[PDB]
From a paper:
The purified heme-bound proteins were crystallized, and the crystal structures of H141A-, Y240A-, and [name]-[name] were determined in the holo-form at the resolution of 1.30, 1.65, and 1.30 Å, respectively. While two different orientations of heme were observed in Y240A-[name], heme was accommodated with a single orientation in H140A- and [name]-[name]. Ferric [name]-[name] showed the ν2 bands at 1556 and 1581 cm−1 and the ν3 bands at 1476 and 1503 cm−1, which were identical to those of the wild type. The set of the ν2 and ν3 bands at 1556 and 1476 cm−1 are due to a high-spin heme, while those at 1581 and 1503 cm−1 are due to a low-spin heme. These results indicate that there is equilibrium between the high-spin and low-spin species in the [name]-[name] solution, as is the case of the wild type. While the heme bound to wild-type [name] is not reduced by dithionite under normal conditions, the heme in H141A-, Y240A-, and [name]-[name] are reduced by dithionite.
[name] consists of two lobes connected with a α-helix, both of which consist of a five-stranded β-sheet and four α-helices. His141 and Tyr240 are coordinated to the heme as the axial ligands and Arg242 forms a hydrogen bond with Tyr240 in [name]. As [name] is a substrate (heme) binding protein that shuttles heme to the cognate ABC-type heme transporter CgHmuUV in Corynebacteria, the regulation of heme binding and release is very important for its physiological function.
Residue numbers in the entry: 32 to 355
Write the structure that this text describes.
Amino acid sequence: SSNGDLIEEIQASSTSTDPRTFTGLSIVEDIGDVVPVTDNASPALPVSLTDADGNDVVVEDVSRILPLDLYGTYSKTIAGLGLVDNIVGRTVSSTEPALADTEVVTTGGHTLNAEAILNLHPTLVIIDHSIGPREVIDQIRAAGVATVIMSPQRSIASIGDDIRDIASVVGLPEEGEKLAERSVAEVEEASTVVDELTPEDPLKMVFLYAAGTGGVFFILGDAYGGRDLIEGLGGVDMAAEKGIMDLAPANAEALAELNPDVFVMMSEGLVSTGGIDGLMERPGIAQTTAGQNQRVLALPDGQSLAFGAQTGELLLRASRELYV
Ligand code: HEM
């Protein structure tokens, strides 16, 4: 097991303690680059496919890839398959160390910039509608860039299938199968450990998204996949209990209604609202159980909702902070 040392450490450390008595910030450090399944990936090209929007695409050259999304998944999967050196641009969400010097093709957060994309002379764009504008995606295709729209399932159960889908696009089915199986083994193993750590009465959680000290401050719902993360950590997602399907402003009324025990956040996002002290100034935060315990689990932004290959490790690291 790639997470074997971590699992052994967790099993040796005590969890008789009541996690409802823990206070303060817990921050999970960056997990780093995905370990590739091969050092000699040899894409079997060309590939013909029909993408998630119904577009027929031929992928004939994967030398210059733009793997773009909101969550940071595709760039990590591409590296896991053996093609990290082929990535020529990224969004702000693909924060993994291997891409730190790679050109960023989004502006103002997540807005696709056509000029930045086309100036990189990509041979393949892998993207989904988690980012836009849609019109920019259309412009890139119209400029002659092979563009493949994905629609990943983004559940823990589908980590392997989402990997296999990416692998098919780039003509690496064997690497896809290896990476899928490794990643699913790691998540199931993590879950066995999480189940041993969790309290009988699960912790109530919400995923709080922040960008700055103003109104970009949301409870994330079904569409963003945080339920999958929260339940993977042994929690109950209060957004799911309330039926939030997209996102909702994290105003005083919503926070009082949801009343989580833990806020799950992204670490750079938390910094952007002034850290835990800045968070505690926001209306309604301090009045929740989580606020009263200053209880925040901050996860590396570009891994937090990426799922993919490193999900198991994320769950183990995060659960250690919740329960040990
Ligand atoms: C759910 C997954 C998401 C992830 C992983 C993510 C990640 C990030 C990251 C890593 C940054 C970079 C901060 C920086 O510029 O230094 C950022 C910025 C930003 N995000 Fe997101 N984001 C997500 C969702 C959203 C959503 C739903 C919105 C708005 C509805 C949003 C709006 C912004 C804005 C406005 C910025 C710019 C902040 C700045 O100038 O620094 N993001 N995001």
